[PDB]
Design a protein around this ligand. Structure first.
Ligand SMILES: *[C@H]1O[C@H](CO)[C@@H](O[C@@H]2O[C@H](CO)[C@@H](O[C@@H]3O[C@H](CO)[C@@H](O[C@@H]4O[C@H](CO)[C@@H](O)[C@H](O)[C@@H]4O)[C@H](O)[C@@H]3O)[C@H](O)[C@H]2NC(C)=O)[C@H](O)[C@H]1NC(C)=O
Ligand SMILES: *[C@@H]1O[C@H](CO)[C@@H](O)[C@H](O)[C@H]1NC(C)=O
Ligand SMILES: [Ca+2]
Lengths: 642, 119, 903
């Protein structure tokens, strides 16, 4: 029969366009479509809206886009996971489905003017309001200010309507108070369990006149290193010029949260011309862990506290680097990025992720499947190398073990890890597959990208594969979906997918073809693939000393700031005395600490593929369905399961 | 075809002396350069420390001001000259170059380089 | 001095934001490349440092975006860095560092640093003698100048120091400020912890609250006393008992099958499940797509039951059989609840009821059973033979009172067939011995708004142990009748007697299904359903706390609501008072009362973890050099680790070179190669590093301090220890020869102090008449007395001179009568210089700013600005030695008497 399909996101937000793709496979004629979305049980229709006409001048593909309105009766049953139906009427035919619903208007972000405030000072704070496309939007926001012990001493509920989603506020901190870590919590009136925060230290202080920066040669300690942890103090007057002074450093081992001092480590070096070397030796370390069985420090971090004092006596300041990973390898391999399901007989490409001991990426670092010398591959800028292997047509769980293959590092210094991948369960042992491959490069917007569409199946029915339909996930909603064609004789085709701002920070690919065979069985083989994109602002923003390049100004002087950004935007400025950071340099604002949310807040959960065809779609955050009965299973749980 | 940056992985240079963190390419016919960033990577996030646009050089962290003269007279060269070297200059530096093609659109190549300081 | 800039011509660097440039600028200019540019011009703050700037932009299409930091650094070739702390305690002598830097690349700088005089501070600077040093800073360097002061003025006070350089034009000046705070110590003394709860002994007459003043007679005067209030609102929400799990009711999906009475048997547990699963929202766990496969299994029953709909719109087993009074209503019951679920026909559901009222009723109102059904086991408690007339009247009637919502103007005598049938119950409810007819008629009477008094008591009390409504026998007519008892208690709105009835049925976890389950299954899930709709969502707060202090003018109506997601508030009173706290209706709330204040010190004060002693004495055998000794150690006797001794030196004093090198190579101690190679030109500050310091012993050291810059007065120095692991855990002792124990000369009574480091009184020769007549018509000359000294109460700290005013030559701000006595204070270090004696007469000037204490008890002070003069006695005037002065002193008076300063 002409199959009618209906893909939409696994979870649909509130006050949000969520698109939904309508397809009428193998069809004849203009076929109208009403689209309907009742609330769940007790059916009042929150969006009858949207209709269209699936003509044969796209090959019967179209869609419709709606907003689920956060109504009064979506504010009645609080704390249990809400629900909708989606009645996809295809004329005489109807194809409905049940979809989960997160409230989650959008994201919120909170700028402090600093990171630590003295009693009697006013905290200046700015709240940015954005729907999950990270656009600005107008809503209503409950804003709490909570004290040390977790108790709120001020509330508000403001409307960011007509403000470029930039809600400035102030809070005069009283002259007497509980010291400690304060909080500013906020939530959209419609999502009071999705609470965005931001902390800021209240503490008595004057500001220093210089900074310290402790840092080892290596971002880790190795245990069979006879030298010991080599460390460098560096100290500089906030105003650029170096220090002559005298420094007290000391070490200790952190272990969960328990921190152990190493009293006998406490050296007193003088500081010449800013810098000051120092070493926590091995023997002095190991003797302070009377656990004594060398290896036991594996995973136990180290920490250095310094305390630099000037030769006048006028000022001092402490500083500590917490978390030096005591390790048996300066690498670490993760299959966070690599799927967990292969395709029997076809390749299985391994997005190997690889890191230095502080969970950062390591660049140009060779990796290898164990059992496969010669074959190897280098990790690129982000920390991803791609390996790839031919699997045998049997359904045996895979057992891959990837090593680092650096020259310079003895084998026992190389890091390794290992995993298990499973076969995509074909529809009634038919051995029909689809495999999406993408070359391995730091993707920037403006470039264009090749997606290989590989088809593996028995040839008796492969001629009836006129297209792979595909869809794109970014930020939680469907970005785009189209058709990449294929005519017979082939096995691979290649989609030159144009890559724009709209894909940042990452995007998925879900694709599928439809075939009838064996006798009268409707088949749907699908595949996914998650692609990382270069994290960057969508727009752009700089501040520079526009006033004649260089020169160097004096107390009082008037200069000028080129601000260079997006036409029809609003910019909000702050300047801060670097001093403040010497105290607290935490919970400032970072584009990337945003993209963290955006991709903490995904709906997609698997790096690719699934246990079968259903898995493919619902892992990747979609809701395939049809008039034949082939569909994803219900999404019970709102969070990705881990 | 397109441009690629000849930037070496690890460059060593002595204490309180100079060094050339190379970053180069080979100019193509129409590929007009419009932005050269040097991004030092201290933490787990990167930051801009040099910048070049329609109006010359522009240093953006004071702890460099007057130490960092990027190399300008040669086409296909963006090497980071760097004098009176400090210990706190140990880091991974990026070289990021932006080109405009004729067809009123744009492309960007960046490569990364560790600066290590010997004694 | 020569070649310089005078103090009056030096402006201070004042502006010291920690954060600034908070601002909004919109990029309105037109896009070039698609990239817009605004040029903000900006004044810079005087803070010498580096400014990090961070921008964030918000755009219509291009979302949020954050720029990068951009550092802008503000610098000088020469400048000061005044190192004020955060706070400093009143009338406790403190030290502060003023750091100067010279960055001229190859240029020595001869400098003059000056502190400026502020009456908020005792300091060497007096208004007619500046505090100033002259020193030579080398190239690429800094140089610490200390300043030792006393904070007199509590609150927020200012500190200004400046400098110019010789043979050049460079100047600079700092004006930070630091916090002055009460002598004593911070205290929180509570005065009341009351519970706001109108009704619970807030009483019928709503909660009214008196709250007394604090203790307060060990208060340190001239200090704040904030009276705080903490209103909280303490809620507790919900008495909703757990739902019966979804994974358990899977067999209740019974496909309806059979005759007229085997269809409603099998329709119920599927029908009831829906109406329970709608209002628990549970479909989640059970399954979601499994609803649409159960809707049509209700509609199927519905339309399979539409066939038996007898000609007269009634219901029985077959169409051949006569109609059952019970099955009509029970169908009205099963359909009425399913009005939502599907399209039920209007003619039908209000057709079965019109059959019952017209045919099946008595005069008093009994709904009799003309057709005893074949499957009775389905009817639950109706199977017994006693009180059938009562319990069946209630069963048919219950369904009518659930089908009264829809059908209002189809059946006209419905406000009628329920009115008679209720009196039958209400009258004959109190002869029931069984739970069933008490639990089921009770629900029937609970839907009329008619169950009170003796009927309700019996209802609520027929429940054994306050939860279940039971009977003797088959234990399904008890999980049934207890859920007529729940549905009455939920139309009673009585959420006191409800929670147990549920809790019992969630322990009897009865999952329907099987033989004769019908009613048990129906009413138990129709009751544990309605519970989860109506039951308190969130126990209610609506406190309207009124406060009204006599201090303030107006009330303070602290509204309170659950929904207010803090439920926390505060009121700050400045003055301690008695204030009424009324409060009105609902909820429950906290009401703390606290006052911050300060009290006297106790005599084991705050050099907590470091005992420190310091001394200074003169030379050895043979300009003036002395022995600076430091003997220190540390409380909690575990040899403290690594430490600082920070020596500030005395104005133009310098340690010896040799002595220091003795101490540097003496083991368990250290002094750095920097501080040695330093010049004799400047060694005014010096740090001794130490390895160890307990209080087992006292670590004793000393050295020789060569003076090289001769001057009058001189400032003391200060040694100050701390361990490197806390610049809090510290102790700052002083030293200096003339005064001893380094302390500056001040004159304190009780609370406040007078900066006493200046002239005792107007100084010294000719003392001509003009010269006298002039100087007592300057600005602040408030009084002029001829005095006789009547007693001379010397002491250690301050002197006393009871002077009797012999005449007022010029009176003023103090209405003193002739013959009356006034006390004059003067510092001890002036004693010998004044040198007075009793019985003797004096001449006295003085200002208004010189008094001490309030009227009528105004003590005078002798300082820099008073004139005190020996006055020869009457007879002693005639003497060729006291001739001139005597004539002039008694010429001075006549001028002032007859004329008065001719201004
Ligand atoms: C279903 O709904 C989707 C939304 O999910 C609808 O999407 C339509 O998609 C197209 C392309 O994404 C969009 O833009 C038009 O396509 C042109 C492509 O040739 C665009 O030209 C240029 O594209 C360049 C690509 O890099 C770009 O650099 C350049 O700036 C320019 O954009 C041009 O923008 C076109 O307008 C449609 O606007 C969009 N529809 C809507 C409502 O805006 C789509 O209608 C539905 N999908 C299908 C296929 O049925
Ligand atoms: C008591 O005083 C301390 C400071 O000494 C303060 O932090 C705290 O808030 C006070 N506690 C009360 C009861 O408010
Ligand atoms: Ca990314």
């Amino acid at each position: 029969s002409p199959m009618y399909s209906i893909i939409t996101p696994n979870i649909l937000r509130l006050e949000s366009e969520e698109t939904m793709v309508l397809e009428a496979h193998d069809a004849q004629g203009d076929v109208p479509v009403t689209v309907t979305v009742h609330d769940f049980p007790g059916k009042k229709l929150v969006l009858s809206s949207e209709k269209t006409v699936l003509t044969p001048a796209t090959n019967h593909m179209g869609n419709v886009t709606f907003t689920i309105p956060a109504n009064r009766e979506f504010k009645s049953e609080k704390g249990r996971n809400k629900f909708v139906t989606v009645q996809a009427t295809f004329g005489t035919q109807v194809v409905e489905k049940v979809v989960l619903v997160s409230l989650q208007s959008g994201y919120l972000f909170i700028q402090t003017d600093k990171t630590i405030y003295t009693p009697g000072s006013t905290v200046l704070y700015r709240i940015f309001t954005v729907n999950h496309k990270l656009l600005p939007v107008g809503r209503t926001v409950m804003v709490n200010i909570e004290n040390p012990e977790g108790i709120p001493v001020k509330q508000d509920s403001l409307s960011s309507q007509n403000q470029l989603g930039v809600l400035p506020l102030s809070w005069d901190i009283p002259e007497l108070v509980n010291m400690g870590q304060w909080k500013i919590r906020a939530y959209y009136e419609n999502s009071p369990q999705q609470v965005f925060s931001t902390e800021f230290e209240v503490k008595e202080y004057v500001l220093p006149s210089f900074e310290v920066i402790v840092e080892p040669t290596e971002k880790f300690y190795y245990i069979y290193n006879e030298k010991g942890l080599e460390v460098t103090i560096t100290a500089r007057f906030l105003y650029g010029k170096k220090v002559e002074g005298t420094a007290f450093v000391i070490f200790g081992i952190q272990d969960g949260e328990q921190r152990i001092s190493l009293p006998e480590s406490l050296k007193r070096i003088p500081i010449e011309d800013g810098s000051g070397e120092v070493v926590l030796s091995r023997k002095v370390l190991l003797d302070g862990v009377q656990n004594l069985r060398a290896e036991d420090l594996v995973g136990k971090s180290l920490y250095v506290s310094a305390t630099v004092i000037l030769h006048s006596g006028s000022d001092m300041v402490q500083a500590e680097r917490s978390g030096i990973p005591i390790v048996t390898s300066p690498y670490q391999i993760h299959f966070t990025k690599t799927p967990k399901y292969f395709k029997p007989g076809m390749p299985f490409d391994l997005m190997v992720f690889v890191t230095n001991p502080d969970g950062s990426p390591a660049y140009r670092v060779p990796v290898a499947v164990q059992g496969e010398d010669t074959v190897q591959s280098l990790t690129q800028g982000d920390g991803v190398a791609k390996l790839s292997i031919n699997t045998h047509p049997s359904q045996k769980p895979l057992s891959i073990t990837v090593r680092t293959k650096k020259q310079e590092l003895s084998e026992a210094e190389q890091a390794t890890r290992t995993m298990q991948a499973l076969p995509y369960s074909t529809v009634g042992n038919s051995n029909n597959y689809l495999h999406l491959s993408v070359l391995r490069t730091e993707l920037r917007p403006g470039e264009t990208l090749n997606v290989n569409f590989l088809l593996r199946m028995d040839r008796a029915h492969e001629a009836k594969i006129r297209y792979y339909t595909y869809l794109i996930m970014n930020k939680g909603r469907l970005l785009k979906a189209g058709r990449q064609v294929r005519e017979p004789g082939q096995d691979l085709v290649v989609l030159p997918l144009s890559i724009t701002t709209d894909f940042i920070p990452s995007f998925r690919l879900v694709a599928y073809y439809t075939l009838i065979g064996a006798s009268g069985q409707r088949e749907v083989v699908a595949d996914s693939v998650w692609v990382d994109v270069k994290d960057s602002c969508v727009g752009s923003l700089v501040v520079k000393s526009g006033q004649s390049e260089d020169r160097q100004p004096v107390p009082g002087q008037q200069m000028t700031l080129k601000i260079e950004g997006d036409h029809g935007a609003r910019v909000v400025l702050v300047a801060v005395d670097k001093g403040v950071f010497v105290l607290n340099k935490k919970n400032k604002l970072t584009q990337s600490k945003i993209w963290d949310v955006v991709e903490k807040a995904d709906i997609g959960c698997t790096p690719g593929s699934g246990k079968d065809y259903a898995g493919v779609f619902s892992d990747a955050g979609l809701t395939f369905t049809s008039s034949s009965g082939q569909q994803t299973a219900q999404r019970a749980e709102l969070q990705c399961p881990q | 075809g397109r441009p690629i940056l000849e930037v070496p992985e690890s460059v060593t240079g002595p204490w309180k002396g100079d060094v050339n963190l190379p970053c180069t390419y080979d100019p193509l016919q129409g590929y007009t350069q419009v932005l050269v960033k040097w991004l030092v990577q201290r933490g787990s996030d990167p930051v801009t420390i040099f910048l070049r646009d329609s109006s010359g050089d522009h240093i953006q962290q004071a702890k460099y001001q007057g130490r960092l003269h990027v190399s300008h007279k040669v086409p296909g060269d963006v090497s980071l000259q760097l004098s009176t070297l400090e210990m706190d200059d140990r880091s991974h530096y990026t070289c990021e170059v932006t080109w405009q093609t004729p067809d009123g659109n744009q492309v960007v190549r960046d490569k990364i380089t560790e600066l290590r300081v010997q004694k | 001095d020569e070649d310089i800039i005078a103090e009056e011509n030096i402006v201070s660097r004042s502006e010291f934001p920690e954060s600034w440039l908070w601002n909004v600028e919109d990029l309105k200019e037109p896009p070039k490349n698609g990239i817009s540019t605004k040029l903000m011009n900006i004044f810079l703050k005087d803070s010498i440092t580096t400014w990090e700037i961070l921008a964030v932009s918000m755009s219509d299409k291009k979302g949020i975006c954050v720029a990068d930091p951009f550092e802008v650094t503000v610098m000088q070739d020469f400048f000061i860095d005044l190192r004020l702390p955060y706070s400093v305690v009143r009338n406790e002598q403190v030290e502060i560092r003023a750091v100067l830097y010279n960055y001229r690349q190859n240029q020595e700088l001869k400098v003059r640093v000056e502190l400026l005089h502020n009456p908020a501070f005792c300091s060497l600077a007096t208004t007619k003698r500046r505090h100033q040093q002259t020193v030579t800073i080398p190239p690429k360097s800094s140089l610490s100048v200390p300043y030792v002061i006393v904070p007199l003025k509590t609150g927020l006070q200012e500190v200004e120091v400046k400098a110019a350089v010789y043979h050049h034009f460079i100047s600079d000046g700092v004006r930070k400020s630091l916090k002055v705070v009460p002598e004593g110590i911070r205290m929180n003394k509570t005065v009341a912890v009351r519970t706001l709860d109108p009704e619970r002994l807030g009483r019928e007459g709503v909660q009214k609250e008196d709250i007394p003043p604090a203790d307060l007679s060990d208060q340190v005067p001239d200090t704040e006393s904030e009276t705080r209030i903490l209103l909280q609102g303490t809620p507790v929400a919900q008495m909703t008992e757990d739902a019966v799990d979804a994974e358990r009711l899977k067999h209740l999906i019974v496909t309806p099958s059979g005759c007229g009475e085997q269809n409603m048997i099998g329709m119920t547990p599927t029908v009831i499940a829906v109406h329970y699963l709608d209002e628990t929202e549970q479909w989640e766990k059970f399954g979601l797509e499994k609803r649409q496969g159960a809707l049509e299994l209700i509609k199927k029953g519905y339309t399979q039951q539409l066939a038996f709909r007898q000609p007269s719109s009634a219901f029985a087993a077959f169409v051949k059989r006569a109609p059952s009074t019970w099955l009509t209503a029970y169908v009205v019951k099963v359909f009425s609840l399913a009005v939502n679920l599907i399209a039920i026909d209007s003619q039908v559901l209000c057709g079965a009821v019109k059959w019952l009222i017209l045919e099946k009723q008595k005069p008093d109102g009994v709904f009799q059973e003309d057709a005893p059904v074949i499957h009775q086991e389905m009817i639950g408690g109706l199977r017994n033979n006693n009180e059938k007339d009562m319990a069946l009247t209630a069963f048919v009637l219950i369904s009518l009172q659930e089908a009264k919502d829809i059908c209002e103007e189809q059946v006209n005598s419905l406000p009628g067939s329920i009115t008679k049938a209720g009196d039958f119950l209400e009258a004959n409810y109190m002869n029931l011995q069984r739970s069933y007819t008490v639990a089921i008629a009770g629900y029937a009477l609970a839907q009329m708004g008619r169950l009170k008094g003796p009927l309700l008591n019996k209802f609520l009390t027929t429940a054994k142990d306050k939860n279940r409504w039971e009977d003797p026998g088959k234990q399904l007519y008890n999980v049934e009748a207890t859920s007529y008892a729940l549905l009455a208690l939920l139309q009673l709105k009585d959420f006191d007697f409800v929670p147990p009835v549920v809790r019992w049925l969630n322990e009897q976890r009865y999952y329907g299904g099987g033989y004769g389950s019908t009613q048990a299954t129906f009413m138990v899930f129709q009751a544990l359903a309605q519970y989860q709709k109506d039951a308190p969502d969130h126990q209610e707060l609506n406190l309207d706390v009124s406060l009204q202090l006599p201090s303030r003018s107006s009330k303070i109506t602290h509204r309170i609501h659950w929904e207010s997601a803090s439920l926390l508030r505060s009121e700050e009173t400045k003055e301690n008072e008695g204030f009424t706290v009324t409060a009105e209706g609902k909820g429950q709330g906290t009401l703390s009362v606290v006052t911050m204040y300060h009290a006297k010190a106790k005599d084991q004060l705050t050099c907590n973890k470091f005992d420190l002693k310091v001394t200074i004495k003169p030379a050895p055998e043979t300009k003036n050099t002395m022995i600076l000794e430091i003997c220190t150690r540390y409380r909690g006797d575990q040899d403290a680790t690594m430490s600082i001794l920070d020596i500030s030196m005395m104005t133009g004093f310098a340690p010896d070179t040799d002595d220091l090198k003795q101490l540097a190579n003496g083991v368990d101690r250290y002094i750095s190669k920097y501080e040695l190679d330093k010049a004799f030109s400047d060694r005014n500050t010096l740090i001794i590093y130490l390895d160890k310091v307990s209080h087992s012993e006292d670590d004793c050291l000393a050295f020789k301090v060569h003076q090289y810059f001769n001057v009058e007065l001189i400032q003391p120095g200060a040694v100050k220890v701390y361990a490197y692991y806390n610049l809090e855990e510290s102790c700052t002792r002083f030293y200096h020869p003339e005064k001893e124990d380094g302390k500056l000369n001040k004159l304190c009574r009780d609370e406040l102090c007078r900066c006493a480091e200046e002239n005792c009184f107007i100084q010294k020769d000719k003392v001509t008449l003009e010269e006298r007549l002039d100087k007592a018509c300057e600005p602040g000359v408030d009084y002029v007395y001829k005095t006789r000294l009547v007693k001379v109460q010397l002491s250690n700290d301050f002197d006393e001179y009871i002077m009797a005013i012999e005449q007022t030559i010029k009176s003023g701000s103090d209405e003193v009568q002739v013959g009356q006595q006034r006390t004059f204070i003067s510092p001890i270090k002036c004693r010998e210089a004044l040198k007075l004696e009793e019985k003797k007469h004096y001449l006295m000037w003085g200002l208004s700013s010189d008094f001490w204490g309030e009227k009528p008890n105004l003590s005078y002070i002798i300082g820099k600005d008073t004139w005190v003069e020996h006055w020869p006695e009457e007879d002693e005037c005639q003497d060729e030695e006291n001739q001139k002065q005597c004539q002039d002193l008694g010429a001075f008076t006549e001028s002032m008497v007859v004329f008065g300063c001719p201004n």
